[PDB]
């Protein structure tokens, strides 16, 4: 049956590179795969959009996420695909919750119906310090620290789902680790 | 400072007319007014996004909510701090009536979401121009967003609005939208006189 996976981290963590490495690996094995991303995977018009309150930003991204789940991810899963999302709800929680200081219970209330309760089977978190991530792809430092630390809090709360990787390791070692975590899940 | 007023009802009820007439009346009395509306007062592009084919009711609500959240923070609250009478043609009640009662989204979820989205801001008074849905639907076409919903949808909306008004009778002023336009304007203005003064 289908398998829902996500990739998470700061921009410049290697999250996107790894998403593509994992899709390409599944394609090479002949395993049906759907690579997608947030924001934009549900309502592309939300993505290109742009001076908002973080409450409005979160709601807009939730609307996108609601369509993404219903129109893209769930159908992919019903088809038996490995659906890989570059960013999902954890991004909003980390950035809007821990970063901007929006209340986590509200964020989660909104999410319950936006996602219809859909959670990924595994989430690969490319963890590194903001300074390293900024070097790699160019608000400020203290904000990105709160985001980084929020992701780690999420990972501690849901240790079965999160796979925390040192995003400073060589790409290839990371890719191989991700493949190793996936291998037993693939029929 | 300031005074927050809203108008609500089915399209064709006359709430748009009345909001405009009320603004012009208060302007004639020398009062600063901000006449605004939803959807679009916060994020004008939500109007376009609302015309996505087969949009889930959840996403439609969240779109309205994003618009409202920005509406409140960038338009309504600044206007109120500036002493203005801010009049919105549609606010939270429209979401509750249309996406809740009409489309069937769970009301407690809508309320949970709205509590932060709106920053807890409620209008001082809300003028609900009530009439039967069949009567509304003869007056004017439905917005593009709502093309291909039937009478029973609009009945559930009409009835939702009345339910909201029963629960908050101090905020809602329910008016018969089948009275003459001048009588409705008179009534709205009479409700407002003791406040403005
Ligand atoms: Ca990270
Ligand atoms: Ca990358
Ligand atoms: Ca990978
Ligand atoms: Ca995730
Ligand atoms: Ca969400
Ligand atoms: Ca209508
Ligand atoms: Ca009107
Ligand atoms: Ca009036
Ligand atoms: Ca709105
Ligand atoms: Ca209202
Ligand atoms: Cl899954
Ligand atoms: Cl990245
Ligand atoms: Cl999740
Ligand atoms: Cl877990
Ligand atoms: Cl109207
Ligand atoms: Cl008048
Ligand atoms: Cl709302
Ligand atoms: Cl309200
Ligand atoms: Cl009529
Ligand atoms: Cl009340």
UniProtKB/Swiss-Prot annotation, chain A:
Q: Which BP terms from GO are recorded?
A: dTDP biosynthetic process; dTTP biosynthetic process; dUDP biosynthetic process
Asked if the keyword Signal belongs to this entry, the reply reads no
Lineage: superkingdom: Bacteria
GO CC terms on record?
A: cytosol
EC number of the protein: 2.7.4.9
- Gene3D superfamilies according to UniProt: P-loop containing nucleotide triphosphate hydrolases
The record's keywords, sorted A to Z, are: ATP-binding, Kinase, Nucleotide biosynthesis, Nucleotide-binding, Transferase
Checking SUPFAM superfamilies in the record gives:
P-loop containing nucleoside triphosphate hydrolases (SSF52540)
Question: InterPro entries in the record, alphabetically?
Answer: P-loop_NTPase, Thymidylate_kin-like_dom, Thymidylate_kin_CS, Thymidylate_kinase
Instruction: List the catalysed reactions.
Output: dTMP + ATP = dTDP + ADP
Q: Which residues bind ATP?
A: 9-16
CDD domains per the record? Answer: TMPK
Q: Name one GO molecular function term.
A: ATP binding
Is Iron set as a keyword in this record? no
Q: What does this protein do?
A: Phosphorylation of dTMP to form dTDP in both de novo and salvage pathways of dTTP synthesis.
Q: Which family does it belong to?
A: Belongs to the thymidylate kinase family.
Annotated protein name in UniProt: Thymidylate kinase
Q: What is the species of this protein?
A: Thermus thermophilus (strain ATCC 27634 / DSM 579 / HB8)
Q: Give the gene that encodes this protein.
A: tmk
């Amino acid at each position: 049956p289908g398998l829902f996976l996500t990739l998470e981290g700061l921009d410049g963590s290697g999250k996107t590179t790894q998403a593509r490495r994992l899709a390409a690996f599944l394609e090479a094995q002949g395993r049906p795969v759907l690579l997608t991303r947030e924001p934009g995977g549900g309502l592309p018009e939300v993505r290109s959009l742009q001076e908002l309150s973080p409450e409005a930003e979160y709601l807009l991204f939730s609307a996108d996420r609601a369509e993404h789940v219903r129109k893209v991810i769930l159908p992919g899963l019903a088809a038996g695909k490995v659906v890989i999302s570059d960013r999902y709800l954890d991004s909003s929680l980390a950035y809007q919750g821990y970063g901007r200081g929006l209340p986590l219970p509200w964020l989660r209330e909104v999410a319950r119906e936006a996602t219809r309760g859909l959670k990924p089977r595994l989430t690969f978190l490319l963890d590194l310090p903001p300074e390293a991530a900024l070097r790699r792809v160019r608000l400020g430092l203290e904000f990105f620290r709160r985001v980084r630390e929020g992701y780690l809090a999420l990972a501690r709360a849901e240790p079965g789902r999160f796979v925390v990787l040192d995003a400073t390791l060589p790409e290839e070692e990371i890719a191989r680790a991700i493949q190793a975590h996936l291998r037993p899940l693939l029929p």
